From a paper:
During eukaryotic replication, the helicase function is provided by the [name]-MCM-Go-Ichi-Ni-San (GINS) ([name]) assembly comprising [name], GINS, and a hetero-hexameric motor known as the MCM complex (minichromosome maintenance, formed by the [name]-3-4-5-6-7 subunits) (Ilves et al., 2010, Moyer et al., 2006). MCM belongs to the superfamily of AAA+ ATPases (ATPases associated with various cellular activities), which contain bipartite-active sites with catalytic residues contributed by neighboring subunits (Neuwald et al., 1999). We imaged ATP-hydrolysis-driven translocation of the [name] using cryo-electron microscopy (cryo-EM) and found that the six MCM subunits engage DNA using four neighboring protomers at a time, with ATP binding promoting DNA engagement. To identify any additional states within the two major 3D classes, we performed further classification focused on the ATPase domains. This analysis led us to identify four different DNA engagement modes of the [name], with global resolutions ranging from 3.7 to 4.5 Å.
In three of our four structures (states 1A, 2A, and 2B), single-stranded DNA is engaged by four ATPase subunits via a set of pore loops arranged in a right-handed spiral. In three of these states, ATPase pore loops from a set of four neighboring protomers form a right-handed staircase spiraling around single-stranded DNA. These protomers are [name]/2/5/3 (state 1A), [name]/6/4/7 (state 2A) and [name]/4/7/3 (state 2B), respectively. In states 2A and 2B, two neighboring AAA+ modules (which we refer to as seam subunits I and II) appear detached from the staircase. In three of our four structures, ATP-bound protomers are all tightly interacting and staircase engaged, and flanked by two (state 2B) or three (states 1A and 1B) ADP-bound protomers. Conversely, no direct DNA interaction can be detected for ADP-bound seam subunits in states 1A, 1B, and 2B. We note that the DNA in states 2B and 2A has a register shift of one subunit, resulting in vertical DNA repositioning. Transition from states 2B to 2A involves release of 3′ DNA by [name] PS1h and ATP binding by [name], which binds to the N-terminal end of the AAA+ staircase. Conversely, in state 2B, duplex DNA can only be seen to interact with stabilizing helicase elements such as the B domain of [name], whereas in state 2A, the incoming duplex DNA is not well resolved. Two-dimensional averages of side views confirm that states 2A and 2B indeed show dynamic duplex-DNA engagement, explaining the weak density protruding from N-terminal MCM in the averaged cryo-EM volume.
Numbering used by the authors:
A (entry chain 7): 3 to 66, 69 to 87, 93 to 110, 126 to 138, 146 to 306, 321 to 646
B (entry chain 3): 4 to 100, 106 to 206, 210 to 246, 252 to 268, 271 to 302, 304 to 305, 308 to 338, 340 to 343, ...
C (entry chain 5): 246 to 271, 281 to 308, 312 to 394, 396 to 405, 408 to 409, 412, 418 to 489
Write the structure that this text describes.
DNA sequence: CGTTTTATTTTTTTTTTTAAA
């Protein structure tokens, strides 16, 4: 009904009259800048958004089908060359075909792209470009996709054009050529990859958020086919939001399994959005301790545990001597059953700590948290399909009540104590998998709540092999204190009468600001001046004497010294001064001492 | 356009459009300003037969063709009154409102719009199908069109085939989408309601866009439909029934703003505790006052841009043999709240490695049994005996109330707000403090605040209570009977109790539920002083005067329970406020 | 056409049909089609059992004996009509077969109209054959343990059900309670004290019940 | 210048895995 032509005039006016002076800084040509970026042979994809055309008019806020507009604008600016020879493979290869002498898509050279979920996705959504957020599933890989090949006749010579949109196809035969027409001189048909056009191609399933799905519902997935430039633009288990099109899928073939008008739909892509800049404001603030003041406000007091965590948040200790690496990840252990809200801090960290994970005391047996295997006589063979502990690299996978899972379960996790090494002689390998995950252990005491008669490993039943792999072991008990629980109570009830706990003692730090300030930290690689080396080796001995002077005491591993070394240089990442010094390790030992000497007194 | 009655038949529905029923009641400002846009009008056959009984038969022998017709008259009516609800030119199907067993559809009722009741089951995949073809001629640029059809809509099909191209001359020919519309299609089957059965025989149905899965496999319904069968037996035959509306019977409410006005006015009677505690189980001394919250679920709490705290309560207590004929009066009445077998699994929350069902299957039978009680409640027996494997799988819940397992199946997280109860048996009988409270049962005390109480249930047969037991328990046993059928009404001692037979009643009770389960009674200025002062003194003075005897679970995580008890009380009177005397209801547990 | 809805399993038939076919031929050479159809079956009326599916002189038989108030203890030598046992205590059956009364209430509960009774002892007492007769003397099944007890066609999963099948008005009397697997010993606790029935293999919940009961037989300890 | 296209299900033995007083 509407004209698909006079709109071409409208958009010519739009892009031509485009230096839109709404602010100091727009009299220059915006899409002229992008135009010349095409003339730079650089940009192969431009972009449309609601604001852009919204100011222009109000038709096309509901006209744009999303399909005809694209081919029209593409051909429109393809024939727009207001503007150098050897820039591309194919681009110069046409000149090679012209050295002795098309649709503008075959010289593609560029592209353009432009508050609901699958559940709400009402089935009158065809063609409309809509918005949904999900979770990625079943990570796959990318291959080339033809669009239009060049089936030359050789004897005749006529590089045939087979521009295709389908996903299945059929060959082109000997010759639809002019000289290979009724004029008897002809050869045969045969493509030339070099002059052919293909396109990247990434696909993966999309599962539901799991926060919307009603009481009587089961999450389901859709399919994602993103081709061309945008490939490799999301990993598995990223909570991502996509604007694209719903489009049906003409699954042609058999004439009785189809022929229902089957309509097994699918989706077309534009983008994978997943829900220094700070430097001037980072200049506004210079403090070390306020992180604890604004990280996890939900409980008053017990800062020491939190700062112990924030160190693991800090990081920044690693070296590769002798060819071999060193574990630069901290792994805390946790015993206790008070009301701590380990579940609290776990949820807090797992939210703010990007690339987080969670498992429970029996939810993942030894094969699930790591890679595993499967069985099916319908899809082919089976793979490892690693688990949370496999996936949580550059981060932490947080087990809750590792004490209660199982004794043999300590094995495979103990294997990852020596980091980045997940050996598997199961699928005919000694595979590695790079287990590069910081580890969070939290459990409860044994029968009772730290019965003072039943001593350590008298009350506990854990082999030394795992405690040795753990930098810090922490028992948490707070006996009846008349004054203690008061403050904690009124503190809790504050966000019950209210929504935001801590007033007027610090500036709260949002997830964004917190993460960004932490983002500026770890790349210092600071200086530990040489006097420490003689000094610290002395101080370590101070431990090893008061370890031996009582005979019913803890054993020690070389990691005790390696740990007390490992922690200090990390914290200088958040000092941001490349200056590992006395305080850098005096806090290390201080917190180590606080880890102990707490259960007798 | 068959035998030319078709238009006259259209007129007869258009002739539905003249006076007080049409002119006052029916449509126009009966749907359109209430703004649903859903084509489907309710028909009521007794009126149409009161006008055109011949046309009340016009369906009941040939309902193949009343449909384009009905839609035509409707678009004429709605299309010649409202220009807004008119840019949806399609069929715009309607109501069409003999119930026979799915076992008694016997060659016949072909052409008839008739009823069967049964089970929703095998609720299945959803996939749209295609109506028209908005084809374009991009050289000549004419948006031409090609409609389609199926037997599942009418009798005929077009040359149902590939979306065409290169049809006229070989010009620029291509589709246009976003306009070539589509139709949401669903498939499922129904069974007879099993109690009648002496293999009970099923039926198969097919749906459309506004008819799409109004309930779930595990529900049951009355459903009305026509009949066909397309295939050509021996040049076999197999049928399906269709052309449908929807209804449903197993729900619960003539409740406009009158019934809310009913529920408010009786509020102020202060000790409803009396009434609502003596309400469901007068067939039982004893608790019912205490039961309150296992029905109410709990309360919701969210921190800005943070996390939350789970809200609902879980308690159970007793001498052997009231405990199996007790966990009731809500299992029946409470909305969709399910206790379980007592010693059950393959369905608490596990996969149960058994791949002998469909030869594949990753999640093919991964699920539990409390998510069917999401925002409900549960009870069971035999906990005193049950396995310790999924005790693990409890400790996640009572702490969190979200299930998060990933033994390679999948890395789960799924809402649940649920509560649940337990069993008991004293492994040695009548010992509660002479020996001790704990471990006359064979039990564990790690679950301190997991459940929200340490409580007790006791008995001894006596000499002094001997005739008390006799005369009361038999007072029950003959106030069991009428005039105190096979059993008329038992009045006295509910009429000496100056009561009335529609004030002790279920719909009269849940009169005060649906709305009471909707409020947000925030805290004021009294918990803050009360709770910390008192739990501080309690966790120390529960340690003297022989009450260290029964002081097993003292925690400060209990402090949520101390609130969500009274939270129910704040919606027991629907006051968005709270008192010190509201406190006493959430201390008197002690 | 009309000869369905006529016949169910466990019956005895005479028939006339046709020997006819469905396949075609010339299967290493030609193996083919058996079946028959119906024309006009004639079924049996086997004697005295089938007051089951398809007088007042007998009421006069009934009542003039109950006119005598001598049934309570008279039929204490009838339930074992030909052999010895339970003699002075067989009077306690008078309550159970008639049962009590499933006296519903205005309140929640549906009382235990179903009520249960016991036997236990050694073999040799005719305890095998006595209850053997009791199936002959309303409706039930009778053996003990693992022996009732927890298709390749048209892709529908059949499930023939549980234990209220022949016992919902019918009641039973069986041995070997502990002489039985403990997987199928939860159900008894659900069956019996309440008929607290449910289903969980697939995702739907049979809310079944019954007016049924049991007796127990025994060869347990001492 | 005419006359024709197209479907498969259950059981084994290994290597995985999983159960009760
Ligand atoms: N001082 C406090 N700060 C913040 N929250 C608190 C405090 N004291 C109590 N709470 C609340 O009490 C609840 C106690 O239950 P919680 O989730 O702590 O179990 P848990 O202590 O993690 O159990 P376990 O330690 O046995 O795993 C917590 O959710 C927490 O929010
Ligand atoms: N105070 C009471 N109120 C109502 N009923 C009672 C009361 N006291 C006793 N009864 C009756 O006594 C019976 C006791 O047997 P019951 O069915 O409770 O066994 P049970 O407690 O379930 O056994 P177990 O707990 O060992 O499985 C109940 O059926 C109940 O009706
Ligand atoms: N008082 C009795 N009257 C008749 N038969 C009896 C009597 N006592 C024992 N019997 C015999 O006992 C046999 C049944 O024994 P049974 O109850 O099967 O032993 P068990 O219970 O060990 O299997 C019958 O065949 C019957 O002949």
């Amino acid at each position: 009904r509407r004209d698909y032509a006079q709109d071409r005039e409208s958009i010519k006016t739009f892009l031509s009259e485009f230096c839109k002076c709404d602010d100091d800084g727009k009299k220059e040509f915006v899409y002229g800048s992008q135009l010349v970026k095409l003339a730079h042979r650089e940009q192969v994809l431009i972009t449309i958004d609601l604001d852009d055309l919204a100011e222009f008019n109000e038709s096309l806020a509901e006209a744009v089908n999303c399909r005809r507009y694209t081919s029209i604008f593409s051909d429109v600016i393809a024939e727009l060359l207001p503007s150098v020879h050897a820039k591309d493979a194919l681009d110069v290869y046409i000149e090679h075909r012209l050295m002795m002498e098309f649709p503008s898509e075959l010289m593609k050279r560029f592209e353009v792209g432009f508050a609901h979920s699958i559940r709400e996705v009402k089935a009158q959504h065809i063609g409309k470009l809509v918005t949904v957020r999900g979770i990625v599933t079943r990570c796959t890989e990318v291959k080339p996709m033809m669009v239009v090949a060049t089936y030359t006749c050789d004897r005749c010579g006529s590089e045939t054009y087979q521009p295709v949109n389908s996903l299945s196809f059929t060959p082109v035969h000997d010759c639809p050529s002019d000289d290979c027409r009724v004029n008897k001189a002809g050869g045969r048909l045969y493509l030339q990859t070099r002059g052919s056009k293909f396109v990247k191609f990434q696909e993966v399933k999309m599962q539901e958020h799991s926060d919307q799905v009603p009481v009587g519902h089961i999450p389901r997935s859709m399919t994602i086919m993103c081709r061309g430039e945008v490939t490799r633009m999301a990993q598995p288990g990223d909570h991502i939001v996509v604007s694209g099109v719903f489009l049906p899928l003409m699954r042609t073939g058999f004439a009785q399994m189809i022929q229902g008008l089957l309509s097994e739909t699918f989706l077309q892509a534009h983008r994978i959005i997943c829900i220094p800049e700070e430097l001037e404001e980072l200049a506004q603030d210079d403090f070390y301790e306020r992180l604890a003041t604004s990280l996890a406000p939900e409980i008053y007091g017990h800062l020491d545990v939190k700062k112990a965590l924030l160190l693991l948040l800090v990081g920044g200790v690693d070296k590769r001597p002798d060819g071999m690496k060193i574990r630069g990840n901290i792994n805390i252990c946790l015993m206790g059953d008070p009301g701590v809200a380990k579940s609290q801090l776990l949820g807090y960290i797992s939210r703010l700590a990007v690339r987080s994970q969670y498992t429970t005391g029996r939810g993942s047996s030894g094969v699930g948290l790591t890679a595993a295997v499967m069985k099916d006589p319908l899809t082919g063979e089976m793979t490892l399909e690693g688990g949370a502990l496999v996936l949580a690299d550059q981060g932490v996978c947080c087990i809750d009540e590792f004490d209660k899972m199982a004794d043999q379960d300590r094995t495979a996790i103990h294997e990852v104590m020596e980091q980045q090494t997940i050996s598997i002689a199961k699928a005919g390998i000694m595979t590695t998998l790079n287990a590069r995950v910081s580890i969070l252990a939290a459990a409860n005491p044994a029968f009772g709540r730290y019965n003072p008669r039943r001593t350590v490993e008298q009350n506990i039943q854990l082999p030394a092999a795992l405690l040795s792999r753990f930098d810090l072991l922490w028992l948490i008990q707070d006996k009846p204190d008349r004054d203690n629980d008061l403050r904690l109570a009124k503190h809790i009830t504050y966000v019950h009468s209210h929504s935001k706990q801590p007033p007027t003692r610090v500036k709260a730090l949002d997830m964004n600001l917190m993460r960004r300030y932490i983002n500026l930290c770890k790349r210092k690689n600071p200086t530990i001046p040489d006097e420490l080396t003689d000094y610290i080796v002395g101080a370590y001995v101070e431990l090893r004497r008061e370890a031996r002077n009582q005979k019913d005491m803890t054993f020690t591993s070389a990691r005790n010294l390696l740990g007390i070394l490992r922690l200090s240089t990390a914290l200088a990442r958040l000092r941001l001064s490349d200056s590992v010094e006395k305080d850098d390790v005096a806090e290390a030992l201080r917190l180590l001492e606080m880890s102990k000497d707490s259960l007798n007194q | 356009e068959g035998e030319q009655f078709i238009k006259d038949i259209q007129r007869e529905y258009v002739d539905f459009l003249d006076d007080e029923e049409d002119q006052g009641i029916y449509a126009g400002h009966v749907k359109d300003m209430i703004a649903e846009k859903s084509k489907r009008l309710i028909v009521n056959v007794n009126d149409l037969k009161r006008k055109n009984p011949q046309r009340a038969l016009g369906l009941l022998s040939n309902a193949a063709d009343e449909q384009l017709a009905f839609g035509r008259a409707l678009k004429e009516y709605a299309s010649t009154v409202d220009p807004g609800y008119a840019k949806m030119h399609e069929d715009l199907f309607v109501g069409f409102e003999r119930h026979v067993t799915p076992r008694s559809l016997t060659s016949i009722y072909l052409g008839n719009m008739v009823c069967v009741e049964g089970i929703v089951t095998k609720v299945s995949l959803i996939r749209p199908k295609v109506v028209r073809s908005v084809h374009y001629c991009p050289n000549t640029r004419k948006v031409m069109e090609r409609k389609y059809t199926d037997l599942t809509s009418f009798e005929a099909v077009p040359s149902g085939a590939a979306y065409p191209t290169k049809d006229e001359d070989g010009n620029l020919l291509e589709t246009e989408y976003g306009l070539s519309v589509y139709k949401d299609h669903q498939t499922l089957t129904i069974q007879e309601m099993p109690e009648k059965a002496p293999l009970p025989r099923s039926v198969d149905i097919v749906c459309d866009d506004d008819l799409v899965d109004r309930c779930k496999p595990g529900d049951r319904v009355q459903i009305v439909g026509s009949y066909r069968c397309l295939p050509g037996k021996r040049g076999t035959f197999r049928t399906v029934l269709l052309a449908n509306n929807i209804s449903l019977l197993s729900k619960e409410l003539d409740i406009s703003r009158e019934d809310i006005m009913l529920c408010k006015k009786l509020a102020k009677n202060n000790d409803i505790f009396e009434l609502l505690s003596k309400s469901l189980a007068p067939s039982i001394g004893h608790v019912k006052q205490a039961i309150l919250c296992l029905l109410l679920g709990g309360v919701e709490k969210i921190l800005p841009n943070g996390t939350r705290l789970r809200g609902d309560i879980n308690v159970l207590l007793g001498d052997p043999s009231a405990k199996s004929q007790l966990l009731r009066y809500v299992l029946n009445t409470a909305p969709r709240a399910i206790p379980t077998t007592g010693r059950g699994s393959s369905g608490v929350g596990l996969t149960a490695a058994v791949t002998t069902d469909q030869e594949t299957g990753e999640r093919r039978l991964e699920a539990g049994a409390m998510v069917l009680a999401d925002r409900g409640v549960v009870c069971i027996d035999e906990f005193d005996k049950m396995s310790d494997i999924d005790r693990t799988a409890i400790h996640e819940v009572m702490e969190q109330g979200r299930v998060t397992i990933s033994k390679a199946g999948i890395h789960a997280s799924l809402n649940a707000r649920c509560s649940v109860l337990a069993a008991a048996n004293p492994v040695y009988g009548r010992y509660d403090q002479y020996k001790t409270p704990m471990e006359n049962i064979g039990l564990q005390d790690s679950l301190l605040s997991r459940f929200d109480l340490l409580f007790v249930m006791l008995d001894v047969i006596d000499s002094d209570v001997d005739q008390m037991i006799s005369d009361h328990v038999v007072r029950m046993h003959r106030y069991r009977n009428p005039k105190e059928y096979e059993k008329y009404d038992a009045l006295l001692h509910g009429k000496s109790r100056q009561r009335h037979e529609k004030i002790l009643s279920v719909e009269f009770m849940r009169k005060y539920i649906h709305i009471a389960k909707c409020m947000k009674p925030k805290l004021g200025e009294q918990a803050c002083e009360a709770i910390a002062n008192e739990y501080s003194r309690l966790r120390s003075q529960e340690a003297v005067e022989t009450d260290v005897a029964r002081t097993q679970p003292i925690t400060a995580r209990t402090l949520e329970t101390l609130i969500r008890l009274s939270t129910a009380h704040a919606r027991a009177r629907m006051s968005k406020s709270v008192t010190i005397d509201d406190a006493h209801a959430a201390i008197e547990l002690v | 056409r009309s000869l369905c809805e006529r016949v169910v399993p466990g019956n005895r038939v005479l028939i006339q049909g046709i020997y006819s076919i469905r396949k075609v031929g010339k299967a290493v050479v030609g193996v083919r089609a058996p079946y028959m159809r119906v024309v006009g079956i004639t079924v049996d009326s086997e004697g005295a059992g089938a007051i089951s599916r398809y007088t007042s002189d007998e009421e006069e038989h009934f009542r003039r004996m109950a006119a005598s108030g001598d049934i309570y203890e008279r039929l204490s030598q009838s339930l074992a009509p030909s052999i010895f046992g339970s003699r002075d205590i067989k009077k306690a059956i008078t309550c159970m077969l008639f049962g009590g009364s499933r006296k519903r209430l205005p309140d929640g509960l549906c009382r235990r109209g179903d009520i249960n009774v016991l036997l236990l002892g050694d073999p040799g007492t005719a305890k095998s054959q006595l209850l053997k007769f009791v199936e002959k003397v309303p409706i039930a099944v009778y053996t003990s343990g693992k022996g009732s007890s927890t298709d390749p066609q048209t892709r529908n999963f059949v499930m023939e059900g549980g234990a209220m099948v022949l016992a919902d008005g019918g009641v039973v009397c069986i041995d070997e309670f502990d002489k039985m697997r403990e997987d199928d010993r939860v159900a008894i606790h659900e069956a019996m004290e309440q008929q607290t029935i449910s289903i969980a293999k697939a995702g739907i919940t049979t809310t079944l019940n019954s007016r049924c009961s049991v007796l127990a037989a025994a060869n347990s300890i001492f």
